[PDB]
Design a protein around this ligand. Structure first.
Ligand SMILES: *[C@H]1OC[C@@H](O[C@@H]2OC[C@@H](O)[C@H](O)[C@H]2O)[C@H](O)[C@H]1O
Length: 427
């Protein structure tokens, strides 16, 4: 199978997952996409400490079980998270400290893991334990104040609680190999493996934006950790603006590491994101697949002028016009700027540098023209492996009107048909 993300990843023994919010399971649009595209689920908040143990010794798995059951019933494995960390702690735990906090941490781990014993693929036992001050040291938290060995203890407790689950340490800003934080985690994990501390995986949040940009050395980081004898997982992937190249790059980084179990994007649609303003996911709020979706699918499947297959002619802007609203056409291919299209990270097909292939509407027969670039979804396109070019907003294919092949044949949007007048080659 290769038409959905999860299935595409499965071809190499990997998964492609998402974060599921129990509060959205009653949303048909949400579940239709989530059940179809992902084969791994992480509860966005339902399995955290405050959600599972609202009162000391009083566990509640109502929300957690709804996410877990939805996942398994729809064919997805589950990553549990998170058993012990400084954030989202219930009020009672925040006030605890020292030895009492240490015991509370242990009791929580046993309670939650015991409830899901043998049903969880991976557990983020500890998360976000290192600082961002640039010292590569531990984060100052109530948990850290109970002893630097709290993390080690958490893992030993976890292994005993459920020996069938892979135990992971998860964190962010540990993707770039040159950062001190990355080194701090690397050294801790190396020490753990050397001393026999039970740890099976390292999770990389992979939250990329201009403040903490993706860097190609992420692959090196993954490979260095894999070399320590642990699996690695991309746990909360999201990319500011959802750059197609960056999404494909991260996808290929996991594919390049034998021990990379899979990739989880932090949310289904941009509107479901904890950082929606950065439209960092693979689906738009209206459910349409973004340019990055196709880039990722293509990568998982192991994947200038734009020439029509049926006509042998090139996508051309009539008389090299730069006027907004000029409908594009098919024309004999030749070296000219009005036939030179550039596919951008945002999914646009640009010409002249700042003009965009633009759909004047959303239905069959819609005029395809050039228009000033502004970021609209009617200016975004997905380059399918079969040669078709689909509009993100419309879901319709670039189509040479009436199947025409002669110079002057206009271009429109039309229901995809796999026809030769809808197939294009880029060379
Ligand atoms: C990685 O970062 C994102 C965390 O998830 C968010 O936590 C805060 C919630 O308010 C928000 O809804 C969640 O998406 C995740 O737990 C971390 O591991």
């Amino acid at each position: 199978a290769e038409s959905t993300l999860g299935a595409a990843a499965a071809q190499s023994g990997r998964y492609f997952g998402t974060a599921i919010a129990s509060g959205k399971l009653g949303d048909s649009a949400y579940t239709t996409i989530a059940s179809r595209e992902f084969n791994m689920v992480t509860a966005e908040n339902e399995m955290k400490i405050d959600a599972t143990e609202p009162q000391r010794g009083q566990f509640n798995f109502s929300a957690g079980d709804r996410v877990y059951n939805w996942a398994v019933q729809n064919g997805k494995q589950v990553r549990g998270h998170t058993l012990a960390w400084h954030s989202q702690q219930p009020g009672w735990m925040q006030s605890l400290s020292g030895s009492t906090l240490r015991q509370a941490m242990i009791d929580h781990i046993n309670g939650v893991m015991g409830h899901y014993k043998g049903k969880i693929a991976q557990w983020d036992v500890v998360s976000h334990a290192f600082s961002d001050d640039g010292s590569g040291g531990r984060r100052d938290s109530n948990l850290q104040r109970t002893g630097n060995d709290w993390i080690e203890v958490a893992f030993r407790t976890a292994r005993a609680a459920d020996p069938a689950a892979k135990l992971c340490y998860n964190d962010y800003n540990i993707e770039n190999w040159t950062w001190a934080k990355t080194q701090g985690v690397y050294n801790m994990v190396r020490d753990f493996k050397q001393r026999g501390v039970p740890i099976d995986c390292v999770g990389f949040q992979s939250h990329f934006n201009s403040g903490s940009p993706y860097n190609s050395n992420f692959r090196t980081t993954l490979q260095n950790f894999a070399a320590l004898g642990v699996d690695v997982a991309i746990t909360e992937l999201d990319i500011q603006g959802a750059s197609s190249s960056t999404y494909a790059a991260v996808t290929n980084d996991c594919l390049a590491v034998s021990r990379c179990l899979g990739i989880t994007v932090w949310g289904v649609r941009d509107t479901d994101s904890w950082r929606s303003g950065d439209t960092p996911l693979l689906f738009n709020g209206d459910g349409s697949k973004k340019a990055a979706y196709t880039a990722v699918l293509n990568a998982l499947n192991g994947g200038g002028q734009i020439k029509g297959v049926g006509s042998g002619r090139c996508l051309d802007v009539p008389n090299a016009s730069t006027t907004d609203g000029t409908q594009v056409q098919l024309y004999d291919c030749h070296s000219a700027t009005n036939q030179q299209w550039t596919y951008t990270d945002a999914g646009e097909l640009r010409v002249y540098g700042d003009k965009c292939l633009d759909a004047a509407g959303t239905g069959n027969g819609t005029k395809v023209q050039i228009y000033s670039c502004w970021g609209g979804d009617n200016q975004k396109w997905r380059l399918n492996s079969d040669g078709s070019i689909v509009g993100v907003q419309s879901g319709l294919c670039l189509d040479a009107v009436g199947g025409g092949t002669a110079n002057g044949t206009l271009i429109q949007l039309y229901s995809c048909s796999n026809g030769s007048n809808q197939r294009w080659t880029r060379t």
